[PDB]
Amino acid sequence: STGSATTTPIDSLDDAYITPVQIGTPAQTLNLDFDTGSSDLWVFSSETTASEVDGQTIYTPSKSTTAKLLSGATWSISYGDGSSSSGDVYTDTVSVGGLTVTGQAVESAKKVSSSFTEDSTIDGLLGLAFSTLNTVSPTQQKTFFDNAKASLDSPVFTADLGYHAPGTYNFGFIDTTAYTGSITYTAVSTKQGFWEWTSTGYAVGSGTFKSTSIDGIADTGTTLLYLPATVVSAYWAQVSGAKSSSSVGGYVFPCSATLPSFTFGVGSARIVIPGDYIDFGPISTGSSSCFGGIQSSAGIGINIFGDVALKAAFVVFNGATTPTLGFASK
């Protein structure tokens, strides 16, 4: 089997991407944030504290003839940015782009933090990291990809995120029309439960390439590119007036600037992030100070190849017995 679904930016800045997901019988369609940096499929629901729901579409398991309470099971997750959610668990039928999993754990939110409530466009998350990170207790549950894997034509999914435009998540096949040149594959460590890999270096604008190993995660659920302070400083040093602002919480730059590109290495291959992808616009409405899309990972504890990086590539998440990651230009 295969599946194919379009993923759409939630706003003009590409702060996140939503993909429609069919849950239950009859189908209830929710728009979920596909997140290769976590491993829980959770949704706003009829159980979510009413004051914490503001415009989201909810899953109502009582209206699904295939929903079954997973007795005794609870979940609770906290993300790096301080957001969180928790609740109980149902199993139900979940389909993405024509690909159907029966008995998928659908984690129903009883509580969500303010940032989720304030995001009216995101109805939940669909995790695509390794199932070892799943938070369901006392019986850990598998991700949608893990459940689908054996049935897929090939045990893979691909992320093709757009810049200010829709893109595609595919399951079970590689669309050879969706990228240019060849796909370069690179090793993955699953030791932390992430799609963790080592970039071979970077360049800033038309500058020379610096060969240096950068361990990080391919994370569709994080907006920005978080890299070591040395790398980030080298980038922003090429933008007149750019500075790190503790009050804003990162690098900002004059909105009048033209940003240089940023290149990252995948083995001997190179992925170029155009300067425009690094512009996240005014810090507040009407400001002439703009927020940068490349930020320091110092104090995160891990480097994160978030949407800023991934949207510059066609990315293969290869879930073979020994997983690997593939990157192509597009």
What strand order describes the sheet that includes 279-282? 243-245, 250-254, 289-292, 279-282
Same domain, 22 and 112: yes
How far apart CA 101 and CA 79 sit, in angstroms, is 26
Q: Which single residue is written with the structure tokens 């990157």?
A: 327
Beta strand residue intervals within 62-179, DSSP E:
68-78, 84-96, 99-112, 124-127, 156-160, 167-171
Same domain, 104 and 144: yes
How far apart CA 249 and CA 252 sit, in angstroms, is 9
Residue 199 known to be catalytic: yes
Same domain, 110 and 195: no
Under a CB-based contact definition with an 8 Å cutoff, are residues 232 and 292 in contact?
no
* Tokens read off for 306: 């978030």
From 39, 86, 199, 261, the catalytic residue: 199
The DSSP string of 92-125 is EEEEETTEEEEEEEEEEEEEE-HHHHH-TT--EE
Angle at 185 between CA 269 and CA 147, to 5 degrees: 145
How far apart CA 90 and CA 168 sit, in angstroms, is 27
Q: Which of 115, 142, 174 is the last residue of a domain?
A: 174
* Tokens read off for 185: 């594959």
Same domain, 189 and 170: no
Give the number of domains in the chain. 2
CA 293 to chain centre: 15
Q: Which are the contacts of 142, defined by CB distance < 8 A and separation ≥ 6?
A: 105, 131, 134
How far apart CA 133 and CA 194 sit, in angstroms, is 8
Residue 261 known to be catalytic: no
Q: In 3D, which of 316, 31, 302, 82 has the Cα closest to residue 192?
A: 302
* Tokens read off for 21: 């997901």
Amino acid (one-letter) located at 115: S
231 SS3 class? helix
How far apart CA 1 and CA 99 sit, in angstroms, is 7
Same domain, 160 and 220: no
Q: Which single residue is written with the structure tokens 């104090």?
A: 299
How far apart CA 189 and CA 308 sit, in angstroms, is 22
* Tokens read off for 31: 């728009």
How far apart CA 74 and CA 59 sit, in angstroms, is 17
How far apart CA 44 and CA 269 sit, in angstroms, is 41
Same domain, 67 and 132: yes
How far apart CA 28 and CA 38 sit, in angstroms, is 23
Q: DSSP alpha helices (H): ranges in 152-241?
A: 229-236
What strand order describes the sheet that includes 262-266? 269-273, 262-266, 196-204, 210-218, 303-305, 225-227, 294-296
Same domain, 77 and 187: no
Q: How many DSSP H helices and E strands does the chain contain?
A: 4, 24
| Residue 62 DSSP class | G
* Tokens read off for 234: 């080298």
Looking only at the bridges linking them, the beta strands covering 196-204 and 210-218 are antiparallel
Q: C-alpha distances in angstroms, 100 versus 24, 144, 304? A: 11, 9, 30
Instruction: Count Cβ atoms within 10 A of the Cβ of residue 79 and give its class: 0-12 exposed, 13-18 middle, 19 or more buried.
Output: middle
Same domain, 154 and 13: yes
Q: How many CA atoms lie within 13 A of 279 on its CB side?
A: 19
Q: Which of 140, 174, 208 is the last residue of a domain?
A: 174
* Tokens read off for 205: 């604008």
Task: Give the structural domain span for 255.
Answer: 175-330
Q: Which of 174, 207, 222 is the last residue of a domain?
A: 174
Same domain, 213 and 99: no
How far apart CA 323 and CA 191 sit, in angstroms, is 12
For residue 109, the domain's CATH number is: 2.40.70.10
How far apart CA 237 and CA 9 sit, in angstroms, is 29
Q: Which single residue is written with the structure tokens 């679904």?
A: 5
Q: Which single residue is written with the structure tokens 């503001």?
A: 54
Q: Measure the N-to-C terminal CA separation of the chain; round to a whole number of Å.
A: 25
H, E, C per residue of 282-318: ECCCCCCEEEECEEECCCCCCEEECHHHHCCCEEEEE
From 14, 35, 119, 146, the catalytic residue: 35
Amino acid (one-letter) located at 126: L
